Amino acid sequence: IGLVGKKVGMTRIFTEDGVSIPVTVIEVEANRVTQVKDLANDGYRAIQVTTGAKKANRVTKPEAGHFAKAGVEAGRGLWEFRLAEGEEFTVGQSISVELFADVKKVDVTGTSKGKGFAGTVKRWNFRTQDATHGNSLSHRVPGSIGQNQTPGKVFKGKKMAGQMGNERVTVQSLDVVRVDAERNLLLVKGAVPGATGSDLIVKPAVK
């Protein structure tokens, strides 16, 4: 399984031998098990977890009854982790960042920063046409988008301008630099998706 955390920000760890390690600081508070899915009832094995806190006025009655059945306080959302055949968990169990004590590498999933409507230069690394030499109104424009009468259409998946970022991204195989159970912190080497304050899903590295 993995845990849900929050991107606190980036800093560095100086080592004794004079290496500066860039780190993302992930706050991993206790993940509380809200539901256990099994083959009989649900058709697959998983835990649902919550973390953090939510204002009682913002917790709806359907949300509140779901937490109340688990016997846990409401957190800021619900996330599932699939269980391997060995793994087993109880409803209401707390899972801390100590899970990662002996984990060397993690995959971190988050929502990437939102670039809004992006051109082909930014979105797809298209090359600009001439700034000068007679270019008429066609500096950052995409150029040709197809052939001619054959095929007489644009193909699906054609790289064009549009929404960029604000989507789920996983960065794989990041070194775990420190697990600080006391302060509820995981330090991973290098950058992870999303803005400061955003939710992160951290799992032991699949590769």
- Range 110-169, binding another protein (CB under 8 A): 155-157
Taking the complex as a whole, the smallest distance from the CB of residue 162 to another protein amounts, in Å, to 17
Strands (E), the chain: 3-14, 20-27, 31-37, 46-50, 79-82, 94-95, 105-111, 114-118, 162-165, 168-180, 185-189, 199-204
**Neighbour-count burial for 142-157, b at 16+ CB within 10 Å, e otherwise:** beeeeeeeeeeeeeee
**Contact status: 133 vs Mg ion (CB under 5 A):** no
Q: Which of 41, 55, 56, 131 binds RNA (CB under 7 A)?
A: 41
Instruction: For residue 199, give the amino acid letter.
Output: D
Residue 64's binding partner out of Mg ion, another protein, RNA, none, with CB under 5 to 8 Å set by partner kind:
RNA
Q: Which of 19, 84, 131, 137 binds RNA (CB under 7 A)?
A: 137
Taking the complex as a whole, the smallest distance from the CB of residue 182 to another protein amounts, in Å, to 46
Half-sphere exposure for 17 (CA within 13 Å, toward CB): 1
Question: How far apart are alpha carbons 202 and 108 in whole angstroms?
Answer: 5
**Contact status: 11 vs RNA (CB under 7 A):** no
Taking the complex as a whole, the smallest distance from the CB of residue 22 to RNA amounts, in Å, to 18
**Contact status: 165 vs RNA (CB under 7 A):** yes
- Contact residues toward another protein (CB under 8 A) are 155-157
